[PDB]
Design a protein around this motif. Structure first.
Motif, short mmCIF file in Angstrom:
data_model
loop_
_atom_site.label_atom_id
_atom_site.label_comp_id
_atom_site.label_asym_id
_atom_site.label_seq_id
_atom_site.Cartn_x
_atom_site.Cartn_y
_atom_site.Cartn_z
N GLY A 92 33.14 26.91 50.79
CA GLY A 92 32.60 27.93 51.68
C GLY A 92 33.46 29.15 52.07
N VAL A 93 34.71 29.16 51.57
CA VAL A 93 35.67 30.25 51.79
C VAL A 93 35.78 31.09 50.52
N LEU A 94 35.68 32.40 50.66
CA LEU A 94 35.93 33.32 49.55
C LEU A 94 37.46 33.49 49.41
N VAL A 95 37.99 33.11 48.26
CA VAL A 95 39.41 33.11 47.99
C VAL A 95 39.69 34.18 46.92
N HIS A 96 40.43 35.22 47.30
CA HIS A 96 40.72 36.40 46.45
C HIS A 96 42.20 36.43 46.15
N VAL A 97 42.54 36.22 44.87
CA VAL A 97 43.92 36.26 44.41
C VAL A 97 44.16 37.55 43.62
N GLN A 98 45.21 38.27 43.98
CA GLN A 98 45.63 39.51 43.31
C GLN A 98 47.00 39.30 42.68
N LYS A 99 47.12 39.62 41.41
CA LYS A 99 48.36 39.51 40.62
C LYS A 99 48.81 40.87 40.11
N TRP A 100 50.10 41.17 40.27
CA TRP A 100 50.67 42.41 39.78
C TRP A 100 52.18 42.27 39.73
N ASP A 101 52.79 42.80 38.67
CA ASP A 101 54.25 42.82 38.56
C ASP A 101 54.93 41.48 38.85
N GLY A 102 54.33 40.40 38.40
CA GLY A 102 54.86 39.07 38.65
C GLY A 102 54.73 38.51 40.05
#
Ligand SMILES: O[S+](O)c1ccc(Oc2ccc(Cl)cc2)cc1
Length: 134
Positions: A92-102
């Protein structure tokens, strides 16, 4: 009825905690932190089929992302990072992962009572942002 019905609508920021420190951890520079930290965004969430759209609108920046759960996309963030993002639903939780430059940061959005609560984590630093219906 579906997946994200309780998220859909127009939301207004009503409180923030530790957001400057979260932005510092992410790498945001001084002037951007100051102006971004002042902002009182509206968050507008909509769903059309499998596609979820999240808009953030403020005097600082207007941003918009559209995505399908579990399907990676490229995002330019408010502070101009070019990141690769993936958003899933986890209990039920929106989980947003952002990846950049390691590096990696996670933003979680959940419904709690009549609020939409956003938790932003970069290493050991967490910021909490509370939104109410507009
Ligand atoms: O309010 S919540 O949805 C939300 C949206 C985005 C976000 O990450 C930011 C925001 C501004 C800057 Cl300058 C850098 C990173 C943090 C919280």
């Amino acid at each position: 009825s579906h997946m994200c019905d309780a998220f859909v609508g127009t939301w207004k920021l009503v409180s923030s905690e530790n957001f400057d420190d979260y932005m510092k951890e992410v790498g945001v520079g001084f002037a951007t932190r100051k102006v971004a930290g002042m902002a009182k965004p509206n968050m507008i969430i909509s769903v059309n089929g499998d596609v979820i759209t999240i808009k953030s609108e403020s005097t600082f920046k207007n941003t918009e992302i559209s995505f399908i759960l579990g399907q990676e996309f490229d995002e330019v963030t408010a502070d101009d990072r070019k990141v690769k993002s993936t958003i899933t639903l986890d209990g039920g939780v929106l989980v947003h992962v952002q990846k950049w430059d390691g590096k990696s940061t996670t933003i979680k959005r959940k419904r709690e009572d009549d609020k939409l609560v956003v938790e932003c984590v970069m290493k050991g630093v967490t910021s909490t942002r509370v939104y109410e219906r507009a």
